[PDB]
């Protein structure tokens, strides 16, 4: 069954290129100088940006909320392509259709921190499918709470990208963190854990034919799942503190709906 | 990386020493909770009555039965520093770093060892003469109740494992050796150990549930689940400091809860 597994490996590697927008590989050659991005480090950098560029999300007038809900923005349309990928996961469309909704209501966060990485490194974020780069001095100084809220993030992303996956170690990675049996409110566990234990599998031979020197590197991404579940609950209250907290925060009622499941 | 020998070897190593290390095995818990023997049979407290007649057969009730707990969680972190001296390279660590490694790790090696003392029913107490049962625990007042049952969902899941003593070996000593904790001064050679751990851990569970697929990926995945519920336990404890001042913990507690 070691062909089984390397063609589930193909497969989602297959559909990962095709859901996501910015592979990680394109998004290094982009980080590490190798067509170069808009550079956003202050504020008039990001006012020339927005007016050339024209990053989309421009509806608050403060920079600081913009840039949060530029954030939020974009983590609705990652939760889509999460959902589409997910489509083609082999057994997922099969599961009862209530789990296969709390499978994704419960995993995209995970998965958005995990996916973020990818475009990350110690001194920015690239955005709009690698057009900018927003440095991590500009966003880790914007005033009040939202400083705070931006750096975690690359504080995990430097942690985990030590790990130095490809895309075709994450597209099993991902996988593996949809297909999660202990998601409250699953009607039947099973299945899930079936799938799972196959995309564990594929993963472990994967990472031991394309990492053969990296020992261990299977055991120390599932750690990782630690770091994952303890800042997604981070996240959590951190976005409590601000809705509780800024007055400022108001958007069209329609895109609030549109948001309320990442605010 | 390493033998299949040498794995081999730093397995029975490491179930010796837990062997030495710890007084009342999972292999012992799971005699006298299963029964049918005569020798070993516990008697049960499962009400205020009952844990009268407990004091004399082996001040509030509350802060007693969680005085109770607390005193037997120092002595775990003496048995649990005991074993992870025993562990190959431990000792040989800079000594900032293994107090890092303890501080952090003795929680999660409490509930998991916890586990082998519960069933879905009760907790074996005073070393397996005494069996206090899950009702009586999440029936004390106030914020006592919902402190002890969480200790208990966690334990019915792991146990559905069905780990014995020669896996937790092992396993516990690979959540010793984390080189991710807070303040931890060289990582690398906390790592080194924790990948020839890893590697033994792994033919283990090869070997021992060789029908339990991914049993490794599920196991690890607990380590996840510990990492939670250590969190809520430390965070629930402080809120009940700020109420109860019928109680201190154990200097030894106290230091590690200093900074969670
Ligand atoms: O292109 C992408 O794949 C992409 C993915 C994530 C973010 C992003 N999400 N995010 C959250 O707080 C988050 C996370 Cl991690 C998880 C779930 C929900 C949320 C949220 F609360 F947002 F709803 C961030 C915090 C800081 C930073 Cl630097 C980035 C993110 C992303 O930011 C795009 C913008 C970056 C700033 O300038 C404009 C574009 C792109
Ligand atoms: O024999 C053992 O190895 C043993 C180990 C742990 C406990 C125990 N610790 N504990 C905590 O809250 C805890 C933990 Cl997990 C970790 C660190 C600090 C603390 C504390 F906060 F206490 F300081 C519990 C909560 C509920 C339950 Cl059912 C058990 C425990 C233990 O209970 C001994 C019994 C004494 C007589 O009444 C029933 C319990 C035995």
Redesign the interface.
């Given at each position: 069954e070691s062909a089984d597994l390397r063609a589930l490996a193909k497969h989602l590697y297959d559909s990962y290129i095709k859901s996501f927008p910015l592979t990680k590989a394109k998004a290094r050659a982009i980080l590490t100088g190798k067509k170069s991005p808009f550079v956003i480090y202050d504020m008039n950098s990001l006012m020339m940006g927005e007016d050339k560029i024209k990053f989309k999300h421009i509806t608050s007038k403060e920079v600081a909320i913009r840039i949060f809900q530029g954030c939020q923005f974009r983590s609705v349309e990652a939760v889509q392509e999460i959902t589409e990928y997910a489509k083609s996961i082999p057994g997922f469309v099969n599961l009862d259709l209530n789990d296969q909704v709390t499978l994704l209501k419960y995993g995209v966060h995970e998965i958005i921190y995990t996916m973020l990485a990818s475009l990350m490194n110690k001194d920015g974020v690239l955005i709009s499918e690698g057009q900018g780069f927003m440095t991590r001095e500009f966003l880790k100084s914007l005033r009040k709470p939202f400083g705070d809220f931006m750096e975690p993030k690359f504080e995990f992303a430097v942690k985990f990208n030590a790990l130095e996956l490809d895309d075709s170690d994450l597209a099993i990675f991902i996988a593996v963190i949809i297909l999660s049996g202990?998601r409250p409110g699953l009607l039947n566990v099973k299945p899930i854990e079936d799938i799972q234990?196959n995309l564990?599998?594929a993963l472990?031979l994967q990472l031991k034919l394309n990492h053969p020197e990296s020992?261990?590197l299977?055991?120390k991404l599932?750690?990782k799942?630690?770091?994952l579940?303890?800042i997604v609950?981070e996240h959590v209250q951190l976005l409590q503190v601000i809705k509780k907290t800024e007055t400022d925060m108001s958007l069209h009622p329609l895109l609030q709906e549109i948001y309320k499941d990442l605010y």
């Open positions: 202990d234990d564990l599998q472990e020992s261990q299977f055991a599932l750690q799942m630690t770091d579940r303890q609950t």
